[PDB]
Amino acid sequence: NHVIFKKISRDKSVTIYLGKRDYIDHVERVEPVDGVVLVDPELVKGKRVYVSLTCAFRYGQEDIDVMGLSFRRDLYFSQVQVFPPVGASGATTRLQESLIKKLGANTYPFLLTFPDYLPCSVMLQPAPQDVGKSCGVDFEIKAFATHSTDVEEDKIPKKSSVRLLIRKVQHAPRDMGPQPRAEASWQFFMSDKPLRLAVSLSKEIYYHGEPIPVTVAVTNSTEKTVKKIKVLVEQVTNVVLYSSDYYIKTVAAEEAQEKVPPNSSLTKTLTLVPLLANNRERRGIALDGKIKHEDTNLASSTIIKEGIDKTVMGILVSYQIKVKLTVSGLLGELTSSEVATEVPFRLMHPQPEDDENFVFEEFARQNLK
């Protein structure tokens, strides 16, 4: 079985079919959006039909745009002619050949590539506590019909078009970086002896839903007790277009049950799983889609190609493990400050790997249960 997604214009003249809602970037390359457009021959007579792919950044709205009330900067734009048929006939892909075999003679292929310099789907709606507005990067697939008027004004009527917001989803590349690790030491006021914290991760990339084994070694040479060992996954978000908004938020947390007495060491591995489901509040963190939708995830770590300016990504997402130690008799007495350290890591979807029967679903995404 193969689920095909479809949407049809208010006026019934144009119907678009897609194989996926979600298009894979493994960063070596990215999936093209290939699909077909079914037309009503009678409603498209004398008309042209195109499909465009637009990547845009928007600040100030959850979409572009109501009352032109938002800032917008386009990252990429492409458009192909789907009807009348251009040049040679037939599909360039099996999906297309198959969908055309099934749907019949009013169906026409279209294929839209992605380039390698774009970000992946990212959006944020701010929490009450935050300032700065909603923003994100949208990927629009639009199929529309144009016609001519005797006044020589061409027309692109809304009722003849269909707009699908797809996702460009980040999947892991062939290779990952070295084992993440960090070593911090503190010498407190009046003290001759160090508190050391080493922290290590099993690998530099993790998959959404994959448990992250944070291993911690405390060497406490001090007279103090470490009352608490806390471990966080922090999501760090930078808005690099328009407003400068900066967000850092805890998407996962774990507390050890153990303390570290003066003059002792402790080594323990805590396991964290940074999912959006763990978060009651979905606001003020970078997601790959709208809050309302069941399929939405945490944004994957941004990946910038060499030689691309980061502002052109429009929102930067990155992750770190933060380990905070709580030290007895310090705070308000020997420090106004945290004792903590961070180890960065990347978070994305799994590495991808290396006729049929179709079932048609409406493209609109399922709302949150």
- Select 1 or 337, whichever has its Cβ closest to Na ion: 337
Shortest distance (Å) from residue 197 CB to Na ion? 15
CA distance 351 to 56: 26
CA distance 286 to 127: 11
Pairing of strands 226-239, 246-255: antiparallel
Shortest distance (Å) from residue 192 CB to Na ion? 7
- Select 130 or 223, whichever has its Cβ closest to Na ion: 223
- Select 170 or 222, whichever has its Cβ closest to Na ion: 222
Q: Among 74, 79, 59, which Cα is nearest to 139's?
A: 74
- Select 56 or 330, whichever has its Cβ closest to Na ion: 330
Amino acid at the residue 127: A
CA distance 128 to 257: 32
Shortest distance (Å) from residue 226 CB to Na ion? 12
CA distance 99 to 15: 13
Shortest distance (Å) from residue 191 CB to Na ion? 4
Shortest distance (Å) from residue 189 CB to Na ion? 10
Tokens 């690099």 found at: 240
- Select 223 or 342, whichever has its Cβ closest to Na ion: 223
Both structure tokens of 151: 């006044």
- Select 316 or 330, whichever has its Cβ closest to Na ion: 330
Task: List residues bridging with 218 in a β-sheet.
Answer: 197, 266
Shortest distance (Å) from residue 333 CB to Na ion? 12
CA distance 269 to 214: 5
- Select 140 or 223, whichever has its Cβ closest to Na ion: 223
Site for Na ion, rule CB under 5 A: 191, 222-223
Question: Which DSSP state fits 260?
Answer: B
Tokens 């019934």 found at: 12
Q: Residues in the chain, how many?
A: 369
Shortest distance (Å) from residue 193 CB to Na ion? 5
Question: How many other C-beta atoms can be found within 10 angstroms of the C-beta atom of residue 277?
Answer: 10
